[model samples]
Target: PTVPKARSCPFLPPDGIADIRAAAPVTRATFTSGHEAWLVTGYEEVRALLRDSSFSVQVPHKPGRGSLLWQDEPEHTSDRKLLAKEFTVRRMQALRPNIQRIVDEHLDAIEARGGPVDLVKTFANAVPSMVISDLFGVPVERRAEFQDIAEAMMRVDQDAAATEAAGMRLGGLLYQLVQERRANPGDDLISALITTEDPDGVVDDMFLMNAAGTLLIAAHDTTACMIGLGTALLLDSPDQLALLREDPSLVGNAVEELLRYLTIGQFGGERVATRDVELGGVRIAKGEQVVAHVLAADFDPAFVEEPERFDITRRPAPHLAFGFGAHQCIGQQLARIELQIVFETLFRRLPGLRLAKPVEELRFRHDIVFYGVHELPVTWHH
Candidate 1:
């Protein structure tokens, strides 16, 4: 299989997955990089593979210094112990007020701009960018610069050289920031890491810069895409949108549903087998790479009821939208809070909101690692 077969509707998984599931839970496939690997699409298999300690997340020649996302074992474990503390529930709760303020400010700008605006640029992208900038302790004036570099690094529709250029630009900036924090700490994420004692010993400059860059890319782009795409999805399903608008409490479940339905990490979860293991009736050998089709797994009929339906009230289940196990999303709580605030606040404030153009007219991000609309044109009455 060629992995993600063409999708007629961008909101749903490719029809190819259904065919693959009919054949078996796991199948052989080829990645864009021309490497053969086992593709696991069943909900149960993907979950199990994620939790299995024998599987490694590292890929060959992974560019950049070092990111926790690509490390395995004692390294990843110890690093996670140190890094996870910075994104705890209390830490995220403390950030809620600031995140809400960022959301409100973007909404203010959207309202002030009047009709026929690209919500992706005006609101979705802006909110997370500002919040992350503040969280990273970026000076207020340089937030725009931070946002630009983040977008360039994530939206890989451009040429390879361009992607490398963006990585260099962002990496260089983070290197400088880490150095400054070492000498003069402040009340920001970078400063916290610098000042706090680590049982693993002091973090080196290379690892620190890579970690900062990782957060910069991970913190905003994925959530921004979700916000943009989720908003559009809601508008398309007025009944679902009405349910959310009618009850503020539904916002939490609504966000979960959105995450499950959209599973935007379309590149699939990448990992390599550290040792021979049996999964989904197939024996994967050591050193073999495997990719999990999370989109397909999330929509698998075995785990979800009426997987194709977009029901906000559906009972939340263990979904692979954020993957699972040890390497699951560290900032999931932060993402949830951002989504909750935006969705609840958006519909409540603008009851008259609707898309300026039809769904067919909007351009979907077919080329990006994080799937979303390039621009969502929307309008509302005052």
Candidate 2:
């Protein structure tokens, strides 16, 4: 596969992408959707393309249908700035105590339930969904319902009717919440967005709902996948796991390393050329789509020493797993804090944690927008 192939070693980027990078910076490839696009595999090329203003996200936005990623130019810029203010470093830092408590509560339950549990279901899956739900001021009783709708909307491969229904359901739910926040004005993110100063209140119910619902979806699954997959990576590398267990200081470095190593957006970052442009010496006409092969660029040997090795201590050069430039991940700080807490706490508490099933036998999330384990079957001594 010229595009990044599904994992061969499970935790590492596929060997195919490395070969593609070696051959050329850009290559023409056919997506499974049957659309032909240019794939940029070199590290420098990928970063340049992402930072370049000529490329725009191909996903379209409509009144009721699109999220932040779908918008272009002034609207995207404004929305991103507004959203960025909400996910500020101070905000994430302030929320640490609550996130820590959430992590502790889930771990306590996982311990109570005993060994041989699916870590994805028990810990990784539970924590982010709960945290994101709470952030949105989703009622405690409705959190589970919210998670179901979020998952349904993420299912691009599922039935069209089902996905549409899920979107409508979530929109309706968030619409009601936004209206409630407008009247009562609580302390959560929903309230903050709703009550923000605006002359026309143009950040209307749909905008508020879209922002809230988009965050509700974006904030969870990707981090959950990192947790599940990161656990597996550590388990397989006992020495590295030992290093982490022995030294708490390595937690931040380890999280960054895992983010780079996993580079889970396997389908590559899709964008369309807004105008005629040349990238990596390749001429491209306006309106052509390009997929930046993140997995390849992340593992490119030119950028980091020993790119294939999973050493947490290796201070990585800037990577594109999060995508670079104006459209980079908004909730990244929250994700970093969540991951730093989860990885540090989980391993420290369950020192004996290991995979219950062989790594080969575990099913991975190959068919989705993001890559991760479907269920990480893990166990520890009781």
Candidate 3:
């Protein structure tokens, strides 16, 4: 594919929003923040570069960059190796029972609210925030405040000054948590990070601060949107919902399908080509930026049949929702558990749970990397 030199993609800009109208018919553009990059919308091309090492995530020292999303090769590899042990499938399984209880507690609160409740605002959004706070051993009252800071920091369009301020506030909060864990450790994620040692020196103050903040933002809104979006899908598709309700085992596949269908992270991950590479017929040279549009890739017809159909019975498909290669999300296992627990509890507790408003009336956040509904209002038996 021949590259366009002056293409524009909303994704490369701050406060990026998704337009289902535009997304329905895939569009490609050249995007840059003082560099040239292509926003590839085709599935085969996006997946190819996503797995290619030449498209390095190593561009750093730029303000607004530091997390794994901005690192490649040795640094990225070393970073994950440090936390991989604690973020494994076994650790996630060990945390499941607790995850479910935490979810149920929130469900109980929604039930108390009676007839109508905003699921995203009240339950879906709250689950990961509290869970991460639980892992950080943050004081109970500060959970909402913590989630606020996270929401502020990730939106690229938010005032830069405000964003920086939010980042610092979040950093300070994590620092205090780390200090407390240093003196008095708890059976939480932060405590484990403090107690555990990485011989490679990958876990440090900067690393911990980055991890704490990034993990919160990375998991927060996306998990909520998936839940909100998934709920809407199941409700509209009663047969699938009944199948899930009757057989709990279907929850796992259903969740994966939801992740695929929602394609929650619609924005592209910024990557810089470290070397010249041929991708989908386009020649990308060193130092140019490119976005591998994962959502578009998930919907490609060549790789997936009836790519737009919301079918749980579809063959298990590989998705880049967690990303790929060295920069893949470290919290993948934890996310799976959070979604699984929330869905199971949601369906079991309120078997008739559904949108309080018509599906068309709900709104999705625009142009932001991590986004979901303004609110997911749902009603169930009181």
Candidate 4:
């Protein structure tokens, strides 16, 4: 069988994968990349495999170029050292006020238009773009142009050629901002990054450009996907939604529960074993690609009881939603804050929010890297 099949419930892993996890969580499968790999689906095994820092990630073709998340080791640590300060927990808290402002403004627009609207476009897709742009200190004049480039870069069905061009456009736009930030450093993320460095000397025109582009892409893409998918799931599961609405205190837990339940990083964590190792009673040869089925692991009944149920008040479970180990998402804190604030504000203000179209009719972004909806038609009483 293949690594990832399809989602019958939009959020659940494929039946083939779930069946495999039901028995042996570590088994071999053919990935879409046409490479054979060991699929690790058990919650324990996936956590152990990811925590085994010796496992490495590479793009294969370039080995290291144009790579940040896909890169490993000394350079990766160095890169993280250079940028980690801005993503620190305290830094994330400071970003909350502005983030709240952006949420309010966007929600204002959403309210003005009235509902029975595509929440994916009006709320889900738009919030993160504005937040990331504001974080980068992008000028008011260029944000519209920058936002579209960001959107094109994230389009699910975009071809390699089109993606490459959009990437270039994103870089070109950021290049100017990076240069200006370097010369006249400001309180913004890029400017702070300009003055920062590690022993390897991290900041330069290329690094700054790529950094801006990468940060922007990460902010808008995955978070937008989360917003769209989370809303759909919450609305679909009325019991859970009522639980959240009943106890406003559950908002934080609800977001974490949503993250655990969705597990949207569908392809899983891609790593190559550094040496022959035994995992989950299976032998994986050195350099064999190991695909850790994060969603399956998150959904494993072993880790989360009654895993299929979306119970927001469940004791906070250790989840692979942002992954585990050293490579856990750097933007995770930002993402959590955005989601918590979004859902809290979204439901608090629009109490009657519900799906405008049946859940089955909404188009899922199966073609995209971030598994989510293409559009979420939603309505609420004003």
Candidate 5:
């Protein structure tokens, strides 16, 4: 295997990583592209690669243009700061009532339509799409259109040019929305970004549009995976699922365990060496690439307490599911809120919910940027 393909079993980060991690933490691999990169494992190494100031500061100047995803310092530092204010723990937590309303509404629709339903479509994908869009001030009425555009980007396979087309479509939709919000402000992110008095003019129209694009795609896709995968895992372990229902207070830590356990954005924690970096006794040169195998790190026997077990009731070990340092997933707060509500309410609403097909039988998205079931067909009592 060129890279250990995780066909399924997101239960563990595919196998090769474990065998590789068994000896030295940093080992080398070549992608089919013929570029060699070091795979960083063990919990310490993963954190070091992501959080090391030594590595982060090497490139002071960024290459001309990119969105928040690719933006580097001076610009990157400020850009991240301005946008992060909106996603603060207090601010997102303030949306709890509205988020609950959103979650319930989706579940209601699912219940009305009856089962067997593909939860990936109804519950998983639907919730994240609406939350991010609504936060962006996309009108409630156009959610379907917005979701359609988003769905296009996440639609399995359909590689290269076609996929880029989907992004252009999303970019156009966001561009128009930004203009609309600029003209008539709404109580949302676009309105917030544009309306907020930027005396320095740091937040521009393109950045606003690009911010919406990044948040929409990044926040929604990964959260949807967690929703889909988390639900399936809970269903797999009914004993713990029952435990979760009985001990509702555990929802907080349960989500942490779930996030740590699943690690859905399977290929994550990859960083470029700014200056010469050293890891696992390997002297890595500047301008080289290092990949942090997060799933392996999350499961590292050294880092997580009993990393093998998925105990919802147990206290969480510090997990790197969201990576670390400056580039941590800003949408993580939103994602956790969405997951907790879904996992708790979903079971309470449809107590009878169970997989319509075997978990192993479903189409797993090994081909995409995120790891999850492509569709989770489940049956439940209406």
Candidate 6:
């Protein structure tokens, strides 16, 4: 197999979240697509590119890179509008109490186990899957089944055909659920979408299914990683940990910093240039395929002082991890609320939580587009 060493190289890089951060300020490389893509490592460039409307999310029927993230505007605008209301700041607030309950239950199980535990699978991963199922009104029995499907989406090694197959299966399942809601509306996101009409008009069944599956996959996988990764990161700095414990109110701010540091997804969905535009002396021609280097942007020295250091106390600045502008991730508020609760509950419940092994020995997921710790082997005094 031809291994890719640089961003411009053929194969995608390894999946571990930490490794990508280490490779920040990546060397700009060319790709097999015959495009001169800049793997922007500088913060300013990343932020600029994300806001630049010239860059379209959809590419022209490419292989491997997944859907919708690749759609170009103004089609992208219309596509995003179809389901934007489903994940508002208000909607995210509604789920917080329920999410808190779920978090508490997971912690209880961890305490019961005693000794060492894999917090990733037991707690972080568990909460979001159930929350997503609740959001979609997916029967409790089917939550675990969908979680596996979400996991498959992040594992980068899957071939193009396999990736599409899994995506299709999820889409199909949700599509069926939408049909059910149409006839018999229930009290869930699916039901809400079915009953509520968009301001423009009613969202069709296909759009509803795709949007639901996209949200499910995003909600399940990323929050799960954030829980494990954020906890592990905080544990490394005793001062930061102590500060957080002393002032639990800081948990919300800390979550933002952690999101910036982790920068969960490695690459921005491919965007096409609608018209020729000049970017830092680089001319992006019309219809060119461009990749927004998000991780690189977050670490750039210009925007983030001491780019390499992780500081929970840093003031919140807009980061491209969730993207920017009209196409920014719709689930932003919901993710923030869930992650803030995750940090608060984690430390509040287990004050003595510590890594079970040396930091160097902890495993990381390095096979896919998103990166984070695989299993947070943690032990703490109860």
Ranking by lDDT: 1, 4, 2, 5, 6, 3
User: Total clashing residue pairs per candidate?
Assistant: 0, 0, 9, 0, 0, 10
Quality of model 2 by C-alpha lDDT = 0.77
TM, every model: 0.93, 0.91, 0.83, 0.94, 0.91, 0.83
lDDT of 3 at 346: 87
Off by over 4 Å in 4: 60-67, 157-161, 267-269, 367-370
Q: Top TM-score: which candidate number?
A: 4
lDDT of 1 by residue, 1-382 (tens): 4766678987888767787876777878886775788888899998888889888875531623336777777778877777666646787778888987888888888788787889988888788877878887888787778778776676656888988898888778788878878888888887887755676564678767877777666666778888899999998999998888788799999999999999846533478877899988798989788887777788889998889999999987878888888878877888888889888888887777899999899888643454688889998877
Return whichever of 2 and 6 wins on TM-score: 2
Per-residue CA lDDT of model 5 for 208-287, tens digit only, reads 86677777766667888888888888888888888887887888788999988888444343577778978766899987
In candidate 2, the residue pairs with backbone N, CA or C atoms under 3 Å apart (3 or more residues apart, or in different chains) clash, namely none
In candidate 1, list every pair of residues with a backbone clash.
none
Query: Model 6: per-residue lDDT, tens digit, 234-341?
Result: 888788888898999999888888888777364346666778876655676786666666665676666778755677889888876798766677788888988888
Regions more than 4 Å wrong, model 2: 1-6, 60-66, 139-164, 266-269
lDDT of each: 0.79, 0.77, 0.67, 0.79, 0.75, 0.68
lDDT, model 4, position 33: 63
How many angstroms is residue 126 displaced in model 6 relative to the true structure, after the best TM-score fit?
A: 1.6
Model 4: per-residue Cα lDDT over 1-382, one tens digit each = 6665766667676767778898788988877766777888899999989898879875531323223677688777766667786646787778899888888988898899888899888888888988888888877897787778878777767678988898777777788778878778888888877777545665677776655666676778778888998899999998988888888899999999888887656533478988888888788899888877787899898897888888888997689988888778888888999998998899998879999988789888553365678889888998
Q: Supply candidate 3's per-residue lDDT for 263.
A: 65
On residues 77-195, what C-alpha lDDT tens digit does candidate 2 reach at each position? 87766666555677667778878888999889889988888998778877887788778767778777877776666555677788789778777777777787778887788787666
Instruction: State the weakest 10-residue window (summed lDDT) of model 5.
Output: 57-66
